[PDB]
Amino acid sequence: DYKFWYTQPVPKINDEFNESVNEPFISDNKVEDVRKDEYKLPPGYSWYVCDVKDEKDRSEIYTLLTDNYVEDDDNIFRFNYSAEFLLWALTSPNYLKTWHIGVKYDASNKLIGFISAIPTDICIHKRTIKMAEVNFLCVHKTLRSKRLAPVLIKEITRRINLENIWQAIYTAGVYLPKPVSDARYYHRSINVKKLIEIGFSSLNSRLTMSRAIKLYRVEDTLNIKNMRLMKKKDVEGVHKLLGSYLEQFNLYAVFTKEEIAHWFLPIENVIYTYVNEENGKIKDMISFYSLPSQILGNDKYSTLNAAYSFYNVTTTATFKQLMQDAILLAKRNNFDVFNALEVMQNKSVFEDLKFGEGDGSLKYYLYNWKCASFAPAHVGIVLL
Ligand SMILES: CCCCCCCCCCCCCC(=O)CSCCNC(=O)CCNC(=O)[C@H](O)C(C)(C)COP(=O)(O)OP(=O)(O)OC[C@H]1O[C@@H](n2cnc3c(N)ncnc32)[C@H](O)[C@@H]1OP(=O)(O)O
Ligand SMILES: NCCCCCCCCCC(=O)N[C@@H](CO)C(=O)N[C@@H](CCCCN)C(=O)NCCC1CCCCC1
Ligand SMILES: [Cl-]
Ligand SMILES: [Mg+2]
């Protein structure tokens, strides 16, 4: 059952809506009526507002997620967002410090839970709505299944509603009421022997080690020869190319110029964006973010270096050629695997480019919004 989720303005498990339905579960909400008081925590635990711009607070969030964040279904790989990744993820334009909420255990003064949101304009089925994007919900492994997570959820909802914002977008690997879409992850091996060693991949009695290395070999030469790291001059051209491209989709972020600068200007070991400029015009782009996983219980390796497909647009090449070059640039940047969801145009190139189907899928959710669900080809946004 979903005893907490049932109490929320989200679809029931059997709710099915027509294409023409595109509206809040609960309208005419009033900032005036929102609770002013912080939700109650169990005895000896306290809210804490985290300053992600302070290196020590940001270290505390980092340590909590390194120890306690999401794993694969077999508990071998744990997401290991870097501290600098977290700074970038949480400091987007017009972010609110008061949306970065920790919970401390009073007796140790240590952070045991966290939840965050950033503001984002989201276009769902051709209506743009101010939303919050919720991410990084984490409770310490030692305090699980004590119903802390609905306290964290209800508290960020209250803070977000104080800002006159009544919809949110979030993603999870767990099934919850009720996905507006569901995208499988696919994986394109780069460092094959490592991936075998750590049990990310496997060999069969058809594939020997040398065969598997040969299969995934790539030519160190770009299809689009001028693709280069994006520069601050490129920001308006990226904004034009990406903004135009994204409008075809059922669900996508509407980016200002300033969000473009934030979300794409490269930061080593965090975000990589490459552009093809022609005539002072940006005609193609490739982006991917770095998200390592800590490898649990492997004597030889501690970390799996992984690049995640972000936003990719081509006007002068094929999309296969574009994504071939995205794999190469990730190889050039020392990544072991290139990961992508079956969103946008991506699935169309998976078989050709030797991506393998994963064992997880990422569900997309909206809070307080009622709409038809859609196939993930129609999803045009990637959350972190
Ligand atoms: C308008 C503004 C709106 C703002 C708010 C919008 C919504 C934002 C929602 C958040 C979006 C975050 C997106 C995001 O960060 C990306 S998805 C990743 C979330 N993080 C992890 O998976 C970290 C590893 N696990 C944990 O820390 C814990 O297991 C957590 C904290 C997840 C659950 O802690 P726990 O100790 O295992 O459980 P209880 O405390 O006993 O709580 C049980 C209740 O929590 C429901 N639950 C479990 N996992 C959930 C999940 N991933 N989303 C939503 N709900 C989730 C569960 O169904 C149950 O409710 P139910 O009885 O109805 O079934
Ligand atoms: N919601 C925001 C973020 C948090 C939610 C994120 C939810 C996802 C959490 C992590 C997760 O399950 N990853 C999956 C996605 O497939 C994953 O890596 N599988 C890998 C490793 C499986 C390890 C064993 N079990 C996987 O299949 N390799 C197969 C690779 C292979 C390459 C060669 C060709 C065939 C397949
Ligand atoms: Cl080259
Ligand atoms: Mg709990």
Numbering used by the authors: 27 to 410
What do the authors report?
CaNMT shares 44% and 43% sequence identity with P. vivax and L. donovani NMTs (PvNMT, LdNMT) respectively; we reasoned that inhibitors of Plasmodium and Leishmania NMTs might be acquired through a ‘piggy-back’ approach, using CaNMT peptidomimetics as a platform. We therefore chose to employ a similar peptidomimetic scaffold based on the Ser-Lys motif, substituting the first four amino acids with an alkyl chain capped by a group that mimics the N-terminal amine, and the C-terminal leucine with a hydrophobic motif. The N-terminal motif of the peptidomimetic was expected to interact directly with the C-terminal carboxylate leucine of the enzyme, a critical residue for catalytic activity responsible for the activation of the N-terminal amine of the protein/peptide substrate. Using antifungal NMT inhibitors as a platform, we developed inhibitors of Plasmodium and Leishmania NMTs, resulting in the identification of an inhibitor, 10, with sub-micromolar potency against P. vivax and L. donovani NMTs, and the most potent Leishmania donovani NMT inhibitor reported to date.
Reduction of the alkyl chain length from n = 10 to 9 gave compound 10, which is the most potent L. donovani NMT inhibitor reported to date (LdNMT IC50 = 24 nM). It also showed somewhat lower activity against HsNMT1 (IC50 = 60 nM) and PvNMT (680 nM). High-resolution ternary structures of compound 10 were achieved in both PvNMT and LmNMT, with the latter structure revealing the first structural evidence supporting the proposed catalytic cycle of NMT. 10 sits in the peptide-binding pocket, and mimics the key recognition elements involved in binding the parent peptide (GLYASKL). The N-terminal amine electrostatically interacts with the carboxylate of Leu410 whilst the hydroxyl group of the serine hydrogen bonds to the His213 side chain. In addition, there are ionic interactions between the amino group of the lysine and three neighboring aspartic acid residues (Asp98, Asp100, Asp385), all of which are conserved in equivalent residues CaNMT. The aliphatic chain on the N-terminus and the N-terminal amino group of the inhibitor are guided by the peptide binding channel to the C-terminal residue of PvNMT–Leu410. Unusually, the inhibitors in this study showed a higher specificity for P. vivax NMT in comparison to P. falciparum NMT. An alignment of the primary sequences of both enzymes (see ESI†) highlighted four differing residues within 6 Å of the peptide binding pocket: Ile102, Tyr212, Ser228, Tyr334 (PvNMT) and Val102, Phe212, Cys228 and Phe334 (PfNMT). Of these differences, the replacement of Y334 to F334 in PfNMT constitutes a structural change in the peptide pocket that could lead to a loss of potential hydrogen bond interactions within the catalytic site.
